[PDB]
Design a protein around this ligand. Structure first.
Ligand SMILES: Nc1nc2c([nH]c(=O)n2[C@H]2C[C@H](O)[C@@H](COP(=O)(O)OP(=O)(O)O)O2)c(=O)[nH]1
Length: 290
């Protein structure tokens, strides 16, 4: 029995201040967090908990690890994010009666739970004013052997179209602003719902297909850095044989260790950048998977 939850270190420029919330249920101070609703992903729940408990909007950045809490016959797992406030105002609500903004050392003294102090230590370990590259493996698209036509053109299946829809809220939680996809229909279709939401066109990326990458890794890596260097938070949707090598290459060049890893259809790598340099690589499950 594993209960899935998420939470955040909500912060703003004062130079950084962090929000600490008071909960009358236990009469003490902590960080925003809560359980995932049915169908929800961790990032979307973290942002939702920020909204409900603090009244603020925010954009999630780097993942800050997990905390595990004993419950009867199982555990509650809470994944945390850094989250930069983007607006909104605190109002007392059904969970939280008070909110204070504190420099990190004062926040550390206010947080009497060891696990919250641990999350805050993870927060200060690396920069938090980060830009984000979102590398997405396209959603499910059936089997190649069942499709007789030009395999470039093979579309998402029903499940995959649902993953594309569910990725809108996932990717919005990280403040996606610009859109890129490898030159395959299944990659474009994965981000078309987001394109409709953002009112953004999808920029085609011939260098980031499986066949291109297999023939030239260096062009793909160079193109990835070009995309990443532009201001904004780009989403780049590509293929299974492309992503692992790109993620590994970037992590090696930056000396960044991913806490988790995978490469499922519909999954996302959140790549956090400080001044152009990678500082986090966070693998997210497909939205319809734990
Ligand atoms: N990577 C790869 N998979 C193939 C090929 N031929 C083939 O039948 N497969 C099978 C085995 C792979 O597990 C599967 C990949 O499914 P997809 O929706 O194409 O995803 P992707 O765009 O690769 O991310 O297709 C091939 O030439 N390359």
């Amino acid at each position: 029995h594993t209960v899935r939850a998420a939470g955040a270190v909500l912060w703003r420029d004062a130079t950084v201040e962090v929000a600490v919330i008071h909960r009358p249920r236990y009469d003490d101070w902590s960080l925003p967090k809560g359980k995932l609703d049915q169908g929800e992903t961790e990032p979307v729940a973290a942002a939702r908990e920020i909204h409900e408990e603090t009244g603020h909007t925010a954009v999630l950045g780097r993942r800050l690890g997990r905390v595990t809490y004993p419950i009867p016959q199982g555990t509650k797992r809470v994944w945390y994010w850094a989250a930069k406030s983007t607006g909104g105002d605190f109002s007392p609500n059904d969970e939280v009666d008070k909110l204070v903004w504190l420099p990190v050392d004062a926040a550390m003294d206010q947080l009497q739970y060891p696990d919250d102090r641990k999350v805050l230590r993870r927060f200060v370990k690396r920069p938090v004013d980060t830009k984000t590259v979102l590398v997405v493996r396209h959603g499910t698209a059936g089997r190649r052997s069942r499709y007789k036509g030009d395999d470039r053109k093979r579309p998402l299946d029903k499940r995959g179209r649902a993953q594309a829809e569910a990725l809108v809220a996932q990717l919005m939680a990280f403040g996606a602003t610009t859109l890129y996809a490898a030159d395959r229909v299944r990659c474009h279709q994965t981000i078309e719902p987001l394109a409709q939401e953002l009112d953004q066109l999808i920029h085609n990326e011939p260098l980031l297909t499986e066949e291109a990458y297999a023939a030239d890794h260096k062009a793909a890596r160079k193109r990835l850095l070009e995309i990443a260097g532009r201001p904004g938070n780009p989403v780049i949707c590509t293929q299974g044989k492309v992503i692992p090598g790109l993620i590994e290459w970037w992590c090696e060049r930056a000396k960044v260790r991913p806490e988790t890893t995978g490469n499922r259809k519909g999954s996302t790598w959140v790549l956090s950048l400080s001044d152009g340099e990678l500082v986090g690589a966070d693998y997210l499950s497909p939205p319809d998977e734990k």
